[PDB]
Each structure stands twice: as C-alpha cells, then as structure tokens.
Amino acid sequence: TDTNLLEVLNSEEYSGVLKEFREQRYSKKAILYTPNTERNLVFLVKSGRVRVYLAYEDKEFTLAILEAGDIFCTHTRAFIQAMEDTTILYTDIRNFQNIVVEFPAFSLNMVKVLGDLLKNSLTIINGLVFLEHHH
Amino acid sequence: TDTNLLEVLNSEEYSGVLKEFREQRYSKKAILYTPNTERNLVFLVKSGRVRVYLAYEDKEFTLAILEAGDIFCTHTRAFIQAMEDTTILYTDIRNFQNIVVEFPAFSLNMVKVLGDLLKNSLTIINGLVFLEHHH
C-alpha cells in the first residue's frame, strides 16, 4: 500500500472521493484551528509546517509538529498554527470516512498520528502529576 | 457515520477475517492490559464494556469508556479494565494493518476512539494546569 498520501492524490488527480479535499493556504503565524472551530475536519499538510499546542500564561505544551504528508484533525482543544507558509488539504470527517473505505492508507496514517499524539499527551500528564506530587 | 463495529462482527462477509483474531474473556473489574504489556496488539470489544485509564503515582484518570463494537490497542501507555463481563477479539498490530488494507471499516472506528481519547487527555492537561496554577 502506498502511504505517501500526496503522491496518491497526485496519481489519482484528486478524483472521485478524493475531490472532496479543498486546499487552503496560511501565512506564517496564522492560526488554522482552535476550540472555536465548528466542524470536525480532517486536514493533510501539503507543504509547510504547523504546530499543535496548548499555551498558557505559565506553561506551554507542544503536542506535535506536522509537516508535508501528515494528517490530523480538529476534534480537540489544541490550537493549530502555521510555522511558515503552509498549504493544507481539508475535508469534513464524513468525507474523510468516504475516502478511507477506498484508500485505507489515509486512515493508517491518521491512526499513527493520533496514537503518537495520544502517547505524548499521556507522558505530559505524568510529568504534571510528578511535579504536583513532589511539591 | 456510525463507526461501531457490531454490524461488522455480525456480518457473514467478515466471518473469515475475524477468525484471524484470538478471543479472550474477562470478568468485571479484570485488567485486560497495562502500559507495560509488551505485545503490540489491536483488540475489539465483542461484548461488554471497558474503561481506558491512566494511573501514575497517587492519581488516576479515566480516558474513555469503550462499548461493544469499539476497537483500541496496546502500546498506548494506558490501562484497560473490564466494567462488566467482557469478550474481546485481538490480533497483532502488523496483522491488523494488513487486515485494514482489505477491510478498512476497522480503522474508522479506531480513528474515532483515538480521537476521543486524545480529546479527553487534552482536557485532563487543561484541568491540571488550572488546578496547579499559582501567582
């Protein structure tokens, strides 16, 4: 299975179920997504780079840096912001599901990203508990 | 979209691929797996209900409750406990990834579950930061 998703899209000429991806460009420092984003969207970074993060007055957490070929979604309270000029391909979760049943590489990549971010987040929780418990 | 896998479990078309999985039964409150489980496995709740949680030092946080027809995996830094008598089907991750190429429905539920777990883990982080903050 070809897991280079951008190559799959190009080979297929963004056809059929893949036509539901829309492209959007973001300048450096532009915020893509936040808790106030309405839909559950899935997005694929086509070029550039975004951070997925939680920033507070007293502390910051970087959950991931996503670059070309990485897929993720807007279902969480994380902020997502461009680090540099960035182009994404996005679609709603239903259209992503319609793509997956034809091109499972999209979900295999999503499961990897989500599992990685979940694992990271659980380490973060442990680190906070450690410092609370040792204070 | 309903991503629940009970309809798949009960479909003749999947009866062959489901034979690739092993089965295991658990009584209420039994621990299915822990963060230290060495085997990298994917498991499907065939019947019953399980709790995914984090325990560390003197803290414990429920991350999600998975119903019959939900799928998850080890190697995700989590504990999993039966909330009632439960039967699971499980297979190793490599085999699961091969299954998904042919039968991607399993992966769509996995995306849903992982997305919910990640959402809930970021909620825990957000709460701990507030509860620990000081001037």
- Percent helix of chain A, as a range, is 25-40%
Count of all domains of chain A: 1
Q: Tell me what the CATH architecture of chain A is.
A: Sandwich
Structural class of chain A: alpha+beta
Give the amount of beta strand of chain A, in percent.
Answer: 25-35%
| Alpha carbon gyration radius of chain A | 16 Å
- What does the main sheet of chain A amount to? 4 strands, antiparallel
Spatial arrangement of strands, main beta sheet of chain A? 1-8-3-6
* Cα-to-Cα separation, first versus last residue of chain A: 50 Å
What would you give as the CATH superfamily of chain A? Jelly Rolls
**Oligomerization state of this entry?**
homodimer
Query: Which CATH C-level class of chain A is it?
Result: Mainly Beta
* SSE pattern of chain A, N- to C-terminal: HEEEEEEEEHH
Count of individual helical segments of chain A: 3
What is the CATH third-level topology name of chain A?
Jelly Rolls
- Which two chains share the most extensive interface? A-B, 39 and 38 residues
- The 3D shape of chain A can be described as globular
Give the number of DSSP strands of chain A: 8
Structure write-up:
Chain A is of the alpha+beta class and 135 residues long. Chain A has a single domain, classed as Jelly Rolls, CATH 2.60.120. In chain A, 33% of the residues lie in helices and 34% in strands. Chain A is built from 3 helices and 8 strands; from the N terminus they run αββββββββαα. Chain A has helices at residues 5-11, 93-100, 105-133; strands at residues 22-26, 31-33, 41-47, 49-56, 59-67, 71-73, 79-82, 86-92. The first copy, chain A, has a 4-stranded antiparallel β-sheet with strand order 1-8-3-6. Chain A has a 4-stranded antiparallel β-sheet with strand order 2-7-4-5. The first copy, chain A, is globular and about 55 Å long. Chain A starts with a helix and ends with a helix. The A-B interface holds A 1, 54, 56, 58-59, 61, 63, 73, 75-78, 93-94, 97, 100-101, 104, 107-108, 110-111, 114-115, 117-119, 121-126, 128-133 and B 1, 3, 54, 56-59, 61, 73, 75-78, 97, 100-101, 104-105, 107-108, 110-111, 114-119, 121-126, 128-129, 132-133.
